[PDB]
DNA sequence: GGGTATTCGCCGCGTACCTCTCCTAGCCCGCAAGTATCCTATTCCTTGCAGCGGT
RNA sequence: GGAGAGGUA
DNA sequence: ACCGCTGCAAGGAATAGGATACTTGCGGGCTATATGGCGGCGAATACCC
């Protein structure tokens, strides 16, 4: 923790203090690769989730019964709010946020 | 502590390790699931997946 | 008004069994335990007043 | 009693 | 029948030691912000006459 001085310009030190604060307990991993939680050693499997980035997907003509496709483009962030652009059957361009 | 312990102890991806073989352990540590938080649900997943 | 198209929202998605784990969050107030402190004694010295022999 | 995971036919 | 004396308390300097006010972490006791599913269908708007 560092304390500035109010009257002095932005950027200055009146006095700075620090200490070793405890926080949390992270379980460790045995030699084999299995955690022990409550005498019931468990394992964590990996996940196969779709990657962040951009995807230009489309629907295979399963809407409007007109045989007309509708391309759409999605931006998927790693942490935040998504974003989508879509084409209405009338060739408009619609944004859509978090559905 | 709560935020980490709840994940490690009770999640959809920290599962009890069946241990009735060497092979079961080895093939369970290499599993590649697609369910869980951020994935697709078990019972409403299409066929193309 | 009126016939029509388009959208929104609700309803639904197999049976039976076995194994395991985990089940609210945060504040608060009494309360046990452990402690630093304060009053309690002893030994030395130099005063201030009441008895007291003596004449 | 309720959830989650895995398994058998 | 008056007095200076002895003597017996009251307040200063040096050590040991328990009592006791003070501080603290707890244990139980209580209160109160998602984003990979379609298909059918019927009601509720939209629309352009």
């Amino acid at each position: 923790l560092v304390i500035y001085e109010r009257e002095a310009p932005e950027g200055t030190v009146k006095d700075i203090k620090e200490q070793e604060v405890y926080m949390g307990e992270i379980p460790l991993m045995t030699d084999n690769g299995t955690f022990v939680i409550n005498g019931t050693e468990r394992v964590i499997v990996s996940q196969l989730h779709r990657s962040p980035g951009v995807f230009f997907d489309s629907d295979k003509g399963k809407t409007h019964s007109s045989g007309k496709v509708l391309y759409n483009a999605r931006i998927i962030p790693y942490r935040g709010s998504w974003l989508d652009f879509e084409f209405d059957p009338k060739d408009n361009l619609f944004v859509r946020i978090d559905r | 502590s709560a935020a980490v312990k709840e994940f490690f102890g009770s999640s959809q991806l920290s599962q009890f390790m069946d241990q009735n073989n060497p092979l079961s352990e080895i093939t369970h540590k290499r599993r590649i699931s697609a369910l869980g938080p951020g994935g697709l649900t078990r019972e409403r997943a299409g066929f193309e997946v």
Side-chain angles (χ1 to χ4, degrees), chain A residues 1-9 11-63 65-99, chain B:
Chain A
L1 170 59
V2 64
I3 296 173
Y4 294 166
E5 173 49 29
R6 303 172 301 95
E7 276 58 36
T12 185
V13 174
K14 161 171 165 289
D15 61 350
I16 183 169
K17 48 169 77 70
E18 80 188 26
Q19 80 172 23
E20 198 177 32
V21 58
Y22 172 105
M23 66 187 190
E25 263 196 2
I26 55 173
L28 286 185
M29 159 167 293
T30 53
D31 192 2
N32 302 334
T34 72
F35 310 116
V36 187
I37 299 305
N38 310 325
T40 49
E41 58 183 340
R42 325 191 174 202
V43 59
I44 291 181
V45 299
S46 313
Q47 207 185 33
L48 191 63
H49 74 82
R50 65 191 308 191
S51 80
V54 63
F55 305 114
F56 309 101
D57 308 4
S58 78
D59 66 331
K60 287 90 178 185
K62 303 303 178 183
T63 310
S65 181
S66 58
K68 169 174 158 54
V69 297
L70 303 90
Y71 307 143
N72 76 323
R74 174 179 299 94
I75 298 179
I76 315 182
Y78 189 69
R79 170 174 56 93
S81 302
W82 295 29
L83 194 59
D84 307 326
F85 304 82
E86 307 172 353
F87 271 176
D88 187 293
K90 302 201 73 173
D91 290 2
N92 278 341
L93 178 62
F94 282 91
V95 171
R96 187 197 275 260
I97 305 181
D98 291 8
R99 312 309 310 275
Chain B
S1 174
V4 175
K5 182 186 297 183
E6 71 83 7
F7 160 69
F8 268 108
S10 302
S11 179
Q12 302 156 14
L13 290 181
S14 73
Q15 49 194 8
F16 198 75
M17 181 183 67
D18 57 354
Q19 209 174 9
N20 53 18
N21 263 327
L23 176 60
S24 177
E25 306 180 17
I26 287 298
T27 196
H28 193 291
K29 298 173 194 179
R30 300 166 61 84
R31 201 74 97 171
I32 298 303
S33 167
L35 321 180
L40 54 92
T41 311
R42 154 183 311 94
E43 60 212 333
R44 293 192 276 96
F47 178 90
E48 179 54 25
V49 177

